[PDB]
Amino acid sequence: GGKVQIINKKLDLSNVQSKCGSKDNIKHVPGGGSVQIVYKPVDLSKVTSKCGSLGNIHHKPGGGQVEVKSEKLDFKDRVQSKIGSLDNITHVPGGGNKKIETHKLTFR
Amino acid sequence: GGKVQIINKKLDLSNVQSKCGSKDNIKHVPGGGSVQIVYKPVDLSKVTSKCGSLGNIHHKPGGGQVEVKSEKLDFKDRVQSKIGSLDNITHVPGGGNKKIETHKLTFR
Amino acid sequence: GGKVQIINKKLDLSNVQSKCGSKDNIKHVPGGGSVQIVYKPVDLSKVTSKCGSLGNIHHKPGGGQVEVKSEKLDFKDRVQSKIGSLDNITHVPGGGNKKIETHKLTFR
Amino acid sequence: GGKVQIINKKLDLSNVQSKCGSKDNIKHVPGGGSVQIVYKPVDLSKVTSKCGSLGNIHHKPGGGQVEVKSEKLDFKDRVQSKIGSLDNITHVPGGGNKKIETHKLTFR
Amino acid sequence: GGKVQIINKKLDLSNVQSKCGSKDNIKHVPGGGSVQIVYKPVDLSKVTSKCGSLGNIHHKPGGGQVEVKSEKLDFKDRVQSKIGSLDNITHVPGGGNKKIETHKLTFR
Amino acid sequence: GGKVQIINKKLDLSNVQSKCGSKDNIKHVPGGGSVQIVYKPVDLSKVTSKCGSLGNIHHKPGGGQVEVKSEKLDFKDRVQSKIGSLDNITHVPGGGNKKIETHKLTFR
Amino acid sequence: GGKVQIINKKLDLSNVQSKCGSKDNIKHVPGGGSVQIVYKPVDLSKVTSKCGSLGNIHHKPGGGQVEVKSEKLDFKDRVQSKIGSLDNITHVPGGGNKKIETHKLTFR
Amino acid sequence: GGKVQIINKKLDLSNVQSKCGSKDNIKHVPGGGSVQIVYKPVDLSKVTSKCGSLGNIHHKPGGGQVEVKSEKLDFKDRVQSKIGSLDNITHVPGGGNKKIETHKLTFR
Amino acid sequence: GGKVQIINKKLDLSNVQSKCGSKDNIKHVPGGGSVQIVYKPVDLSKVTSKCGSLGNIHHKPGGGQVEVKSEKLDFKDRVQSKIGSLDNITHVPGGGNKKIETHKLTFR
Amino acid sequence: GGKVQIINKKLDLSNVQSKCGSKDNIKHVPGGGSVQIVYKPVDLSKVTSKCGSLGNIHHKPGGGQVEVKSEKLDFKDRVQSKIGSLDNITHVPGGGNKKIETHKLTFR
C-alpha cells in the first residue's frame, strides 16, 4: 500500500518554443534544362513542446497485465532502374556566342 | 490499496509554441525545359504542443488485461523503370547567340 | 509500503527554446543543364522542449506486468540501377565564345 | 518501506536554449552542367531542451515486472549500380574563347 | 527501509545554451561541370540542454524486475558499383583562349 | 586639241564585297541597377563598293571655271553637367546572403 | 596636243573583299550596379573596295580653272563636369555571406 | 605634244582581301560595381582594297589651274572635370564571408 | 614631246591579303569594383591592299598648275581634372574570410 | 623628248601577305578593385600590301608646277591633373583569412 504524492504550488512557466525549418523538395529553380529528382524522402521527424505536462498514470498494484506496443515500419526496396539520365545537350546561358554544335552518333 | 495523489494549485502556464516550416514539392520554378520529379515523399512528422495536459489514467489493481497496440506500415517497393530522362536538348537563355545546333543519330 | 513525495513550490521557469534549421532537398538552383538527385533522405530527427514536465507514473507494487515496447524500422535496399548519368554536353555560360563543338561516336 | 522525498522551493530557471544548423542537401547552385547526388542521408539527430523536468516515476516495491524496450533499425544495402557518370563535356564559363572541341570515339 | 531526501531551495539557474553548426551536403556551388556525390551521411548526433532536471525515479525495494533496453542499428553494406566517373572533359573558365581540343579513342 | 582615249574590251569583274559590323549603343543588357550612358556618338563612316565605275568627266579646254566644294561640320560643345551618378546602392546577385546594409548620412 | 591612251583587254578580276569588325558601344553586360559611359565616339572610318575602277577624268588643256575642295570638321570641347561617379555601394555576387555593412557620414 | 600609252592585256587578278578587327567600346562585362568610361574615341581608320584600279586622269597641257584640297580637323579640348570616381564600396564576389564593414567619415 | 609607254601582258596576280587585329577599348571584364578608363583613343591607321593598281596620271606638259593638298589635324588639350579615383574599398573575392574592416576618417 | 618604256610580260605574282596583331586597350580583366587607365593612345600605323602596283605617273616636260603636300598633326598637351589614385583598400582574394583591418585618419 505505497503512496505517491506530487504537490505543485505557485508554478509560473512561460516561453516554451520548439521550431523547425522548412523541408522543401524542389524549390526556387530559375535554371532550366536540368534533371532534378528527389527519390523517396521519408520524414519521421517530431517537433514537440511540453510545458507542465504529465505522462500516463498506471495504478495497477498486484496486476498481471500484458501491455504490448508495436510499431513495424517496412521500406524494403528493390530498385533496378535508370534514374537521372541527361545527354545530347547544348546549354548556352551566355550571350553573343557563335557556332556551338553538339553531335552524337550511335550504331548497334 | 496504494494511493496516488497529484495536487496542482496556482498554475500559470503560457506561450507554448511549436512551429514547422513548409514542405513543398515543386514550388517557384521560372526555369523551363527541365525534368523535375519528386518520387514518393512519405511524411510521418508530428508537431505537438502540450501545456498542462495529462496522459491516460489506468486504475486496474489486480487485473489480467491484455492491451495490444499495433501500427504496421508497409512500403515494399519493386521499381524497375526509367525515371528522369532528358536528351536532344538545346537550351539558350542567353541573348544574341548565333548558329547553335544539336544533332543526334541512332541506328539499331 | 514505501512513499514517494515530490513537492514543488514557487517554481518560475521561462525561455526554454529548441530550434532546428531547414532541411531542403533541391533549393535555389539558377544553374541549369545539370543532374541533381537526392536519393532517399530518411529523417528520424526529434526537436523537443520540456519545461516543468513529468514522465509516466507507474504505481504497481507487487505486480507481474509484462510491458513490451517494440519499434522495428526496416530499410533493406537492393539497388542495381544507373543513377546520375550526363554526357554529350556543351555548357557555355560565357559570352562571346566562338566555334565550340562536342562530338561523340559509338559503334557496337 | 523506504521513502523518497524531493522538495523543490524558490526555483528560478531561465534561458535554456538548444539550437542546430540547417541540413540542406542540394542548395544554392548557380553552376550548371554538373552531377550532384546526395545518396541516402539518414538523420537520427536529437535537439532537446529540458528545464526543471522529471523522468518516469516507477514505484513498484516487490514486483516481478518485465519491461522490454526494443528499437531495431535495419539499413542493409546491396548496391551494384553506376552512380554519378559524366562525360563528353565541354564547359566554357569564360568569355571570348575560340575553337574549343571535344571528341570521343568508341568501338566494341 | 532506507530514505532518500533531496531538498532544493533558492535555486537560480540561467543561460544554459547548447548550439551546433549547420550540416549541409551540397551547398553554394557556382562551379560547374563537376561530379559531387555525398554517399550515405548517417547522423546520430545529440544536442542537449539540461537545466535543473532529474532523471528517472525507480523506487523498487525487494523487487525482481527485468528491465531490458535494446537499440540495434544495422548498416551492413555490399557496394560493388562505379561511383563518381568523369571524363572526356574540356573545362575553360578562362577568357581569350584559343584552339583547345580533347580527343578520346577506344577500341575493344 | 589633246585626245583622251580609254578602250575597255572583254572585262569580267566579279565578287567586289565591302561589309561592316554592327554599331549598337546599348544592346543585350541582362544586368540591372547600373548607369549606362552613350553620349553623342557621331558616325561619318563610309562603306563603298566600286566595280568598273568611272568618276566625273570634265572636258573644259581653255575655261575659267571656279569650282568650290565646301563641307563645314561644327560640333562645338560646352558641357558643364553631371553625367553618370550612382550611389546608395545595395546590389546582391548572390543567393543566401544575410544582413546586408548600406547607410548614408549627409549634413549641410 | 598630247594624247592619253589606256587600252584594257581580257581583264579578269575577282574576289576583292574589304571587311571591318563591329563597333559596339555598350554590349553584352550581365553585370550590374556599375557605371558605364561612352562619351562622344567620333567615327570617320572608311571601308572601300575598288575593282577595275577609274577616278575623275579632267581634260582641260590651257585652262584657268580654280578647283577648291574644303572639308572643315570642328570638335572644340569645353567640358567642366562630373562624369562617372559611383559610391556608397555594397556589391555581393557571392552566396552565403553574412553581416556586410557600408556606412558613409558627411558633415559640411 | 607628249603621248601617254598604257596597254593592259590578259590581266587575271584575284583574291585581294583587306580585313580589320572589331572596335568595341564596352563589351562583354559580367562584372559589376565598377566604373568603365571610354572618353572620346576618334576613329579615322581606312580599310581599302584596290584591284586593277586607276587614279584620277588629268590631261591639262599648258594650263594655269589652281587645285586646292583642304581637310581641317579640329579637336581642341579644355577638360576640367572629375572623371571616374568610385568610393565607399564593399565588393564581395566570394562566398561564405562574414562580418565585412566599410566605414567613411567626413567633416568640413 | 616625250613618250611614256607601259605595256602589261600575261599578268597573273593573286593572294594579296592585308589583315589587322581587333582594337577593343574595354572588353571581357568579369572583374568588378574597379575603375577602367580609356581616355581619347585616336585611330589614324590604314589597312591597304593594292594589286595591279595605278596611281594618278598627270599629263601636263608646259603647265603652270598650283596643286596644294593640306590635311590639318589639331588635338590641343588642356586637361586639369581628376581622372580615375577609387578609395574606401573592401574587395573580397575569397571565400570563408572573417572580420574584414576598412575605415576612413577625414577632418577639414 | 626622252622616252620611258616599261614592258612587263609573263608576270606571275602570288602570296603577298601583311598582317598585324590586335591593339586592345583594356581586355580580359577578371581582377577587380584596381585602377586601369589608358590615356590617349594615338595610332598612325600603316599595314600595306602592294603586288604589281605602280605609283603616280607625272608626264610634265618643261612645266612650272608647284606641288605642295602638307600634313600638320598637332597634339600639344597641358595636363595638370590627378590620374590614377587608389587608397584605403583592403583586397583579400585568399580564403579563410581572419581579422583584416585598414584604417586611415586625416586632419587638416
PDB file of C-alpha atoms in Angstrom, chain G residues 21-85:
ATOM      1  CA  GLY G  21      34.536  44.340 -87.364  1.00  0.00           C
ATOM      2  CA  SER G  22      31.686  45.552 -85.208  1.00  0.00           C
ATOM      3  CA  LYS G  23      31.908  48.862 -83.341  1.00  0.00           C
ATOM      4  CA  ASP G  24      29.549  48.459 -80.381  1.00  0.00           C
ATOM      5  CA  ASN G  25      29.429  50.929 -77.506  1.00  0.00           C
ATOM      6  CA  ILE G  26      27.849  49.059 -74.562  1.00  0.00           C
ATOM      7  CA  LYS G  27      27.077  45.445 -75.459  1.00  0.00           C
ATOM      8  CA  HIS G  28      26.524  42.176 -73.564  1.00  0.00           C
ATOM      9  CA  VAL G  29      26.525  43.411 -69.973  1.00  0.00           C
ATOM     10  CA  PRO G  30      25.129  40.860 -67.482  1.00  0.00           C
ATOM     11  CA  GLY G  31      26.920  42.635 -64.645  1.00  0.00           C
ATOM     12  CA  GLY G  32      25.060  45.306 -62.728  1.00  0.00           C
ATOM     13  CA  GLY G  33      25.444  48.116 -60.246  1.00  0.00           C
ATOM     14  CA  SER G  34      28.136  49.738 -62.388  1.00  0.00           C
ATOM     15  CA  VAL G  35      28.631  52.993 -64.286  1.00  0.00           C
ATOM     16  CA  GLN G  36      29.414  52.536 -67.984  1.00  0.00           C
ATOM     17  CA  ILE G  37      29.874  55.702 -70.049  1.00  0.00           C
ATOM     18  CA  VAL G  38      30.943  56.012 -73.685  1.00  0.00           C
ATOM     19  CA  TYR G  39      31.450  59.760 -74.132  1.00  0.00           C
ATOM     20  CA  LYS G  40      31.491  61.061 -77.747  1.00  0.00           C
ATOM     21  CA  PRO G  41      32.727  58.265 -80.059  1.00  0.00           C
ATOM     22  CA  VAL G  42      33.525  60.016 -83.380  1.00  0.00           C
ATOM     23  CA  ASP G  43      33.743  57.603 -86.371  1.00  0.00           C
ATOM     24  CA  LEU G  44      35.315  58.813 -89.667  1.00  0.00           C
ATOM     25  CA  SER G  45      36.296  55.322 -90.848  1.00  0.00           C
ATOM     26  CA  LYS G  46      36.220  54.243 -94.490  1.00  0.00           C
ATOM     27  CA  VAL G  47      35.816  50.682 -95.790  1.00  0.00           C
ATOM     28  CA  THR G  48      36.339  50.632 -99.552  1.00  0.00           C
ATOM     29  CA  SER G  49      36.576  48.025-102.324  1.00  0.00           C
ATOM     30  CA  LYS G  50      37.710  49.201-105.767  1.00  0.00           C
ATOM     31  CA  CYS G  51      37.891  46.703-108.634  1.00  0.00           C
ATOM     32  CA  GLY G  52      38.674  47.886-112.153  1.00  0.00           C
ATOM     33  CA  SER G  53      37.552  51.443-111.399  1.00  0.00           C
ATOM     34  CA  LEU G  54      38.826  54.793-112.645  1.00  0.00           C
ATOM     35  CA  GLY G  55      38.981  58.195-110.994  1.00  0.00           C
ATOM     36  CA  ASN G  56      37.904  61.573-112.273  1.00  0.00           C
ATOM     37  CA  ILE G  57      38.856  62.489-115.841  1.00  0.00           C
ATOM     38  CA  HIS G  58      39.814  66.138-116.377  1.00  0.00           C
ATOM     39  CA  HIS G  59      40.649  67.161-119.952  1.00  0.00           C
ATOM     40  CA  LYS G  60      41.336  70.893-119.580  1.00  0.00           C
ATOM     41  CA  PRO G  61      44.214  71.986-121.846  1.00  0.00           C
ATOM     42  CA  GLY G  62      45.199  75.621-121.384  1.00  0.00           C
ATOM     43  CA  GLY G  63      42.546  76.318-118.767  1.00  0.00           C
ATOM     44  CA  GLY G  64      42.476  78.701-115.836  1.00  0.00           C
ATOM     45  CA  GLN G  65      40.167  76.783-113.515  1.00  0.00           C
ATOM     46  CA  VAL G  66      40.137  77.238-109.744  1.00  0.00           C
ATOM     47  CA  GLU G  67      39.112  73.965-108.087  1.00  0.00           C
ATOM     48  CA  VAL G  68      38.789  74.212-104.299  1.00  0.00           C
ATOM     49  CA  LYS G  69      37.630  71.335-102.092  1.00  0.00           C
ATOM     50  CA  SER G  70      37.330  72.135 -98.386  1.00  0.00           C
ATOM     51  CA  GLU G  71      36.194  69.838 -95.540  1.00  0.00           C
ATOM     52  CA  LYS G  72      36.209  71.684 -92.157  1.00  0.00           C
ATOM     53  CA  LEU G  73      35.401  69.391 -89.160  1.00  0.00           C
ATOM     54  CA  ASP G  74      35.284  71.200 -85.762  1.00  0.00           C
ATOM     55  CA  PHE G  75      35.025  69.383 -82.378  1.00  0.00           C
ATOM     56  CA  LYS G  76      36.048  72.130 -79.923  1.00  0.00           C
ATOM     57  CA  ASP G  77      35.058  70.978 -76.449  1.00  0.00           C
ATOM     58  CA  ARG G  78      34.920  72.750 -73.078  1.00  0.00           C
ATOM     59  CA  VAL G  79      33.914  70.074 -70.571  1.00  0.00           C
ATOM     60  CA  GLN G  80      33.811  71.081 -66.893  1.00  0.00           C
ATOM     61  CA  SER G  81      31.525  68.438 -65.443  1.00  0.00           C
ATOM     62  CA  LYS G  82      31.377  65.368 -63.190  1.00  0.00           C
ATOM     63  CA  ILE G  83      31.451  62.144 -65.221  1.00  0.00           C
ATOM     64  CA  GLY G  84      31.203  58.643 -63.789  1.00  0.00           C
ATOM     65  CA  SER G  85      30.632  58.935 -60.042  1.00  0.00           C
TER      66      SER G  85
END
